[PDB]
RNA sequence: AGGACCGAACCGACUAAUGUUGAAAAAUUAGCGGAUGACUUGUGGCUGGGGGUGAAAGGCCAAUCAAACCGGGAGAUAGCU
RNA sequence: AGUCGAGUCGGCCUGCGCGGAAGA
RNA sequence: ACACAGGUGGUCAGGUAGAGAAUACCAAGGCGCUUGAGAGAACUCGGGUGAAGGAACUAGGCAAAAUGGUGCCGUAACUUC
RNA sequence: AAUUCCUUGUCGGGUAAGUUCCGACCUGCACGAAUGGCGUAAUGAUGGCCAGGCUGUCUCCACCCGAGACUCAGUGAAAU
RNA sequence: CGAUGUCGGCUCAUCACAUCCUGGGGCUGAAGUAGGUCCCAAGGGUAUGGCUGUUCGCCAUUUAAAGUGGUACGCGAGCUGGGUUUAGAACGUCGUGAGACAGUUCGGUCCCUAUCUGCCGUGGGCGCUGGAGAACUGAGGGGGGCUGCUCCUAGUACGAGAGGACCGGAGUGGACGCAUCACUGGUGUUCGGGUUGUCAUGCCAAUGGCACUGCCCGGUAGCUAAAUGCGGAAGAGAUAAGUGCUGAAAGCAUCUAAGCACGAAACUUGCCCCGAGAUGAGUUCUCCCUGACCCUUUAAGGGUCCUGAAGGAACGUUGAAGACGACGACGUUGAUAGGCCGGGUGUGUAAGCGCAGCGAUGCGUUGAGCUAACCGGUACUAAUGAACCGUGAGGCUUAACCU
């Protein structure tokens, strides 16, 4: 998962 | 009071004839042999140590039998203080017997706990399990978070973790006295009381009124 | 925890370890002195010492019960027809565990176990 | 042990007749409203017995007024008065739980 | 998971002042044969307290 | 041992067949009703014409359980199966004129005299 | 009879657990779908990079794909680090 | 202020304090 | 890349049970998987059993439990029959 | 409504209690007729919802069997 | 921005007090019951469900109460992955179109073996001034601290009635915690039995292997909860808000300035556990060692020979002790373990033989046989004579005592 994703 | 040194016999029932069955601890009371009084002068506080049972000849080192041979009494088994109330004496050499609980209602009693060994929070701490299923990832009966973030960025003290559990001394406290056997040297007292089969006891009145 | 528990699992199923013992105990009633690990050697007493003492009293029954324990006509003749009464006056006690160091290849603590008269 | 032995076999009752599991037994009991101590009977089918000393044991399973009914007796209690083998029962196991999922015609032992 | 500094040498054998192996305290002598052995066990020419067993 | 979602059987005539516990009430968290316990409960199944009807929430009072009841010998008691007798909500009074099947001692109270008076046995 | 039914081989890959410096750069275990067909498989052949091929997902084209790989223009250019 | 026998009352300007003042 | 739990087309096809090339146990034949020995803590993995309750769990019955064969009886709405 | 922002619309059903589901209403923010409309038996490792059965999913965990974990001997990594 | 994983849930919390409950008070438009409002108080306690990704909220039903906040919107090197937040697809809508939408919809990989700090446990070293074995003192630290209902007081006080107390007492519960296994039970692949398929032991009979322990039924010890004992306190001290007594300043008044009293789950104790590394290393009791020499830098000096205590460790047999260490028992002058003997318990009437039956089977011998971890015993086996470590009377100064 995106490290402070969008 | 003084209270006694005995043994953990095991547990058993008194049908009475009313109807009830009350669980009963059968603790083995042989005589307590005074082995030193503490004074106020010499020691700065009051109290007797006692000796029960026996030990054997060989196994009593000379140090051990010294302390004995001042008292005048056999080895026993152990050593164990009572702190003396305002007014008790006892003297060295004196035996008390179980006969000294006759006319006593409750007891503490204090052994060391069965030991667990090595337990986990579950067991130790009565930690809730996270989910069996439900997508759990090798978390079953682990303990879940141990502390906060950055403030305060360590894990307090206390906190509750698996470590070792029981083999340590517990007291249980105000059990009825059910029987005072002199003859058998039995002291019968309600439930249960800390400790497996054949491990030591001490019994106190006690000390809630 | 394992309070009052008997038995060694020896890193086995129970199956594995009923079968290893039946094996054990014949060759040690065959031989009359084997060489293992001190662990095996000594709940190997507690398999091979009750079928001398079954084998102490000699019928059909005991023949039979020692054959289902053991599966071996050789070993169930040997125990009844040489050993029960070789140890009849004998209350237990048929083997002795001798401890012999170390095994090269593991470092497993090694012991003789052997019949006591041998 | 030794010891524990000897305060059991003092309280117990030497007058339990033999049953076994399968046995119909009549369980009489005392029972207590206020100062008043009537003796009430509980007939039914022994379905295990435990038998462990002074601790022992005994299941009885009777149905009472269209509903199952099982009472675990402590033999030696003094709350029961007596004992009495109506029926001897012709069973093979030591506990007939299996009697539990039986009604009526299926739940019928053969007399011993 | 991992360091974050290299550890010294130093902490390095503190960690192993744990790990000295101990030698045995003493050999027993068997009472026939003289020779040495580790106490309770057989010796290797097959004594144990002064009877020869095993014979090999 | 009833429990919040556990069904039982009712040992009166109210009419209502399958009762659901929807609380064990007397107090907080409270885990467990035994015999002689009040619970609230909701009507699943009720005969066409009689004193309740199906979703109707009220109180009943438990007087058998599978898991029984301990007599201080240490004997037990235990039922085939869980069943209540449903009592009026306000006042805890038996809705029903008729007990079926066994009570217990454990009912021998003020409250419940009643439903001792009824019942066939104990 | 059948892109018919249940179900092994065979072909797949829906769910979960494990594994995640793996036994494995995509698997294992337990279940799961198809199983005479628009099936599956051996051997060989043909289509070539703005090109192929695609029951279409920008899928696949040698563990590489919104333009393969290798060599070359080549020390591209880099007001950026 | 509650015969009594000496101060008393209330505003102003100023110095320094008091309350108002609860947080991980 | 490995003495790698993976991948790899064809042929052969014993016995008892079984519809069977499924499955169980065996034959012929082949193997025990190139670290072992102890111990019997937490916790993890893979399993077995569980009082009373029975979806109250949870985003969601996920997982588990359950059902399961042959013969015969019997089988609703709806329907493109 | 795979479309509805306001919105958990309103009414009915189901539940003790239902922002989901089913039926209905029409105030369609912003359906609609082959970039098809409405319906539809059968079919689906398809989405949503309800029951029976079933259960360690849970109340609330307990014990047990194995493989690791732990100790000994041999070999002997890694990220940083 | 050469990455500080981002909502909610779960698990685990910890603090604040602006207090939800329980405790103490003042005012009341406080008769009582019940409220309102403000002050003190953080000891402990403070629901489960339906719906939704939800936080929240609404609803059902409880409760003494269902507090409000901080802790990276506490907590993904602890779990989840519903939502949000990639790539597939579709709807509405916008756009000629590629596409677009804190609009919706179905689907969509969550890694890390812990070095350091921390924390939970558990050892080794040295120290504590001769060595050793014990028993303690208690500086200090931690745990615990919740509360309902019923009855009595009393249908009393209060009240027109309806209703309905304080204060004090007794009982019995909920939740939580500690211990325990006598009971009730679970488990019990180490006990007994039933039974399917098949293979084997030559065959019959009887057995064993494999099939999830093949499938099952029971069940010993142990472990254990749903089982059953016990706990929260009373009391004391000093107080908070508050209430006073006496009392001037200020002829009065005034709880305050001097003086004196009362006053709460907070605080200090009382209860339980740890505890002398309490380097401020404490105390008490007992035990042990009472030899000579040599040299140099002549000093709390270093060697040599003789000596080797008390005790310890080691090794062994082990344990209701245990990851390993540790801790406990025991080592022949011995019940430490195993075996063995007797018993118990469990299973449920073995095998063989006989009888009955055509036979499956049934019956007798027979409550038989077998029976783990249990109980009581018993030197049969294994726990060895030794060896090892540890020494040889223990510094200086001063004081009081050798009177
Ligand atoms: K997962
Ligand atoms: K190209
Ligand atoms: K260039
Ligand atoms: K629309
Ligand atoms: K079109
Ligand atoms: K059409
Ligand atoms: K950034
Ligand atoms: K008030
Ligand atoms: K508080
Ligand atoms: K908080
Ligand atoms: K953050
Ligand atoms: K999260
Ligand atoms: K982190
Ligand atoms: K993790
Ligand atoms: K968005
Ligand atoms: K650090
Ligand atoms: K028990
Ligand atoms: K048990
Ligand atoms: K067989
Ligand atoms: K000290
Ligand atoms: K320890
Ligand atoms: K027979
Ligand atoms: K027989
Ligand atoms: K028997
Ligand atoms: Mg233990
Ligand atoms: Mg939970
Ligand atoms: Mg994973
Ligand atoms: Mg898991
Ligand atoms: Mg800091
Ligand atoms: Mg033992
Ligand atoms: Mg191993
Ligand atoms: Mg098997
Ligand atoms: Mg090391
Ligand atoms: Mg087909
Ligand atoms: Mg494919
Ligand atoms: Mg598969
Ligand atoms: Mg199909
Ligand atoms: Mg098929
Ligand atoms: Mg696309
Ligand atoms: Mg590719
Ligand atoms: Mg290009
Ligand atoms: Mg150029
Ligand atoms: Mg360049
Ligand atoms: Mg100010
Ligand atoms: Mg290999
Ligand atoms: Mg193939
Ligand atoms: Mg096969
Ligand atoms: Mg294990
Ligand atoms: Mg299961
Ligand atoms: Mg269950
Ligand atoms: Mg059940
Ligand atoms: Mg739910
Ligand atoms: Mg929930
Ligand atoms: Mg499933
Ligand atoms: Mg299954
Ligand atoms: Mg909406
Ligand atoms: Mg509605
Ligand atoms: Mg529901
Ligand atoms: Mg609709
Ligand atoms: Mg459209
Ligand atoms: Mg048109
Ligand atoms: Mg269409
Ligand atoms: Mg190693
Ligand atoms: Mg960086
Ligand atoms: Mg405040
Ligand atoms: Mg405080
Ligand atoms: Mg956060
Ligand atoms: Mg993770
Ligand atoms: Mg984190
Ligand atoms: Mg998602
Ligand atoms: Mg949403
Ligand atoms: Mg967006
Ligand atoms: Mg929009
Ligand atoms: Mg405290
Ligand atoms: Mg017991
Ligand atoms: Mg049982
Ligand atoms: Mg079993
Ligand atoms: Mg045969
Ligand atoms: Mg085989
Ligand atoms: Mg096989
Ligand atoms: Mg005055
Ligand atoms: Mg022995
Ligand atoms: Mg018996
Ligand atoms: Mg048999």
Redesign the pocket.
Known sequence: ?6 | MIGLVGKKV????IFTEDGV???VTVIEVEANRVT?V?DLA????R?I?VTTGA??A??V???????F??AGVEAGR????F?LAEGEEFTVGQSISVELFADVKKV?V?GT???????????R????????????????????????????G???????????????????????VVRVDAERNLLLV?????????SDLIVKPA??? | ???????????????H???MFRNMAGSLVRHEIIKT????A?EL??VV??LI?LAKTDS??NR??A??RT?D?EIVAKLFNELGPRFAS????????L?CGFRA?????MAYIEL?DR | ??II?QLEQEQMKQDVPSF??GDTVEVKVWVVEGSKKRLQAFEGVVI??????L?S?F?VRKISNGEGVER?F?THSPVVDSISVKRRGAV????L??LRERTGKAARIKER | ???????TRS?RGMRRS?DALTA???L????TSGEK????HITADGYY?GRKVIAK | ???????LNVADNSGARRV?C??V????????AGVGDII?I?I?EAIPRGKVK??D?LKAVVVR???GV?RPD?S?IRFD??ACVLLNNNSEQPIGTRIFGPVTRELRSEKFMKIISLAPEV
């Open positions: 998962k995106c490290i402070r994703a969008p | 095991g547990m058993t029932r069955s009350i669980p030193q503490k010499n020691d700065g506080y109290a140590q030990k054997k060989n196994r080192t000379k140090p051990e039998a010294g302390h041979a001042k152990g050593l164990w203080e702190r503490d204090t706990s069965k030991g667990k060994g090595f337990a986990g929070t579950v067991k701490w009565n930690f809730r399990t996270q989910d069996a299923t439900h997508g759990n990832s090798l978390s079953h009966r682990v303990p879940g978070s141990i502390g906060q973030n950055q403030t305060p360590k894990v307090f003290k206390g906190k509750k973790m698996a470590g070792q559990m029981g083999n340590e001394r517990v007291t249980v406290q105000s059990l009825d309600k439930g249960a009381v800390p400790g497996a089969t054949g000390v809630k009124a | 925890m394992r309070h009052r528990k008997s038995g060694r699992q020896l890193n086995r199923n129970s199956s370890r009923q079968a690990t001190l662990p095996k000594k007493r507690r010492e009750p003492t059909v029954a039979r019960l054959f289902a599966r006509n004998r209350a237990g006690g048929y083997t002795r565990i401890k290849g593991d470092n497993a603590p006591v | 042990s030794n032995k076994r599991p295990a017995i435990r038998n462990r000393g601790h044991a299941t675990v402590q093979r196991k030591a506990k739980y299996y | 998971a991992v360091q974050q500094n290299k550890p902490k744990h045995v305290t003493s027993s002598v068997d009472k052995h580790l106490r309770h307290r | 041992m009833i429990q919040e979602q556990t069904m659901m929807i609380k009430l007397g107090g907080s968290h409270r885990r467990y609230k909701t699943k199906k979703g929430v359980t599978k898991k301990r240490g037990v199966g869980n």
